[PDB]
């Protein structure tokens, strides 16, 4: 049901409402290529890990649940990285420095704990896909501004000609540093909670 897969895009965003994917959002958002690849990888890994954890949720002792979940997640990530290196070397070259960051992306384990341990396999798979889409929404939106303003490019295609190449645009150097990502995500949250005001935090 699309209502299940599209909720985490705006209603329950893993970053704008939950705080679960911040590090990679700050790291991999200087190019739309890397942002897109990371979105796909996280979506795939979260879906599969949710499915597998939910398959055996009734046999996991509470004292080793973290170990079980992390073993499944790490195995999936390692196999994915090996396959990419074997068959998609060009793509693997981009994601190589961030391979480890996928294992500790809080989204995967947070959704395994919150949903997969309570729900059934197919619902858990759909939940993983939806959270991946919500994560990718923020990643792509931030990467758009960062890449365009820091280099005048989108997916590596020249859009704003640079002065160094006889153009008119002078790139912004702060768009290649983390503070720009912090500010962009803050203003994105501001807009998201200006619309849909039910998410506004209380007090004051």
């Amino acid at each position: 049901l699309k209502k299940s897969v599209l909720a985490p895009v705006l209603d329950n965003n893993p970053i704008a409402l939950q705080v679960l994917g911040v590090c990679s959002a700050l790291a991999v958002t200087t190019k739309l290529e890397t942002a897109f690849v990371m979105t796909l990888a996280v979506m795939f890994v979260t879906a599969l890990s949710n499915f597998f954890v939910s398959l055996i949720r009734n046999h996991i002792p509470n004292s080793v649940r973290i170990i079980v979940q992390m073993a499944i997640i790490a195995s999936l990530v390692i196999v994915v990285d090996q396959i990419l290196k074997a068959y998609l070397y060009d793509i693997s070259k981009q994601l190589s420095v961030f391979v480890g960051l996928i294992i500790t992306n809080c989204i995967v384990m947070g959704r395994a704990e919150a949903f997969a341990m309570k729900s059934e396999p197919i619902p858990s798979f759909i939940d993983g896909i939806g959270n991946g889409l919500g994560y990718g929404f923020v990643l792509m939106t931030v990467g758009f501004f960062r890449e365009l303003l820091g280099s005048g490019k989108l997916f590596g295609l020249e859009v704003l000609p640079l002065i160094s190449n006889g153009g008119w645009y002078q790139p912004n150097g702060l768009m290649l540093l983390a503070p720009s990502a912090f500010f962009l995500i803050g203003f994105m949250i501001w807009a998201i909670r200006t619309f849909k005001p039910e998410q506004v935090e209380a007090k004051e």
Binding site: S63, V64, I83, Y89, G150
Partner: protein, 257 residues
């Protein structure tokens, strides 16, 4: 806890089974694909060498055939710059350097840090136009802010003019240090002379940009100090007496041929 999951027997059985699974899988994936991964890495190195030499190639077949047609690997002795007989096509300089049979440099001459050892024999790739030599590619490397950076330099047989440079392996932070792989930045290296009239190394990485027509200066990387510095140190070392100094002298005197 429900379904006697708290039992020690149940816990141990579950964990052991889930380890056997995922262990078989990870090991099989890691060991099965090793050869394919190494082949991809070698093909990428060949492509990078061709790119720095200035030859357009696409696809594995074209890359391999062009590399066999145009490039002639050779070995040098560093200490004397003389060409050394050997295979020169399957030589692993990293393994050689790691082997205890090679040199170890004290701090005084270890300009580029965290490279403790240097091999006694290096490999150079001679570009061929016809039957004689048009260019020579020199592999150089040095430690950066995060990890080891490797690159190729494509001097034009006169010993001075650079004519190209690519980084074929580095792990610097994207956006700041990764810009060393920017084509725009790589374009700045064309024509730089690499040596002064006294034949001392003279390549400079200028903080804040280099004046137009510097003939020795290359713009540093914005917000990328210590990695512009690593790029400076790698050249300071590899153009010195401990690196390709003598070999470039023998090339300058016309001995490359």
């Amino acid at each position: 806890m429900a379904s006697n999951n708290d039992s020690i027997k149940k816990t141990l059985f579950v964990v052991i089974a889930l380890s056997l699974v995922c262990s078989i899988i990870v090991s099989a994936a890691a060991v099965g694909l090793r050869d394919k991964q190494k082949e991809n890495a070698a093909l990428d190195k060949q492509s990078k060498i061709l790119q720095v030499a200035g030859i357009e190639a696409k696809g594995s077949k074209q890359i391999v055939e062009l590399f066999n047609k145009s490039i002639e690997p050779r070995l040098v002795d560093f200490n004397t710059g003389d060409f050394v007989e050997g295979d020169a096509a399957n030589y692993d300089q990293r393994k050689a350097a790691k082997e205890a049979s090679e040199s170890i440099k004290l701090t005084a001459e270890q300009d580029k840090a965290k490279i403790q050892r240097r091999a006694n024999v290096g490999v150079v790739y001679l570009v061929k136009d016809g039957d004689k030599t048009s260019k020579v590619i020199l592999p150089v490397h040095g430690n950066g802010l995060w990890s080891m950076m490797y690159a190729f330099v494509a001097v034009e047989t006169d010993g001075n003019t650079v004519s190209g440079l690519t980084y074929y392996e580095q792990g610097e932070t994207p956006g700041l240090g990764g810009e060393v792989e920017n084509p725009a930045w790589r374009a700045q290296w064309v024509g730089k002379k690499l040596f002064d009239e006294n034949h001392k190394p003279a390549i400079k990485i200028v903080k804040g940009g280099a004046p137009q027509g510097s003939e020795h200066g290359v713009d540093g990387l914005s917000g990328a100090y210590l990695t512009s510095n690593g790029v400076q140190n790698t050249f300071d070392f590899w153009l010195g007496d401990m690196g390709f100094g003598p070999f470039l002298t023998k090339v300058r005197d016309g001995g490359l041929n």
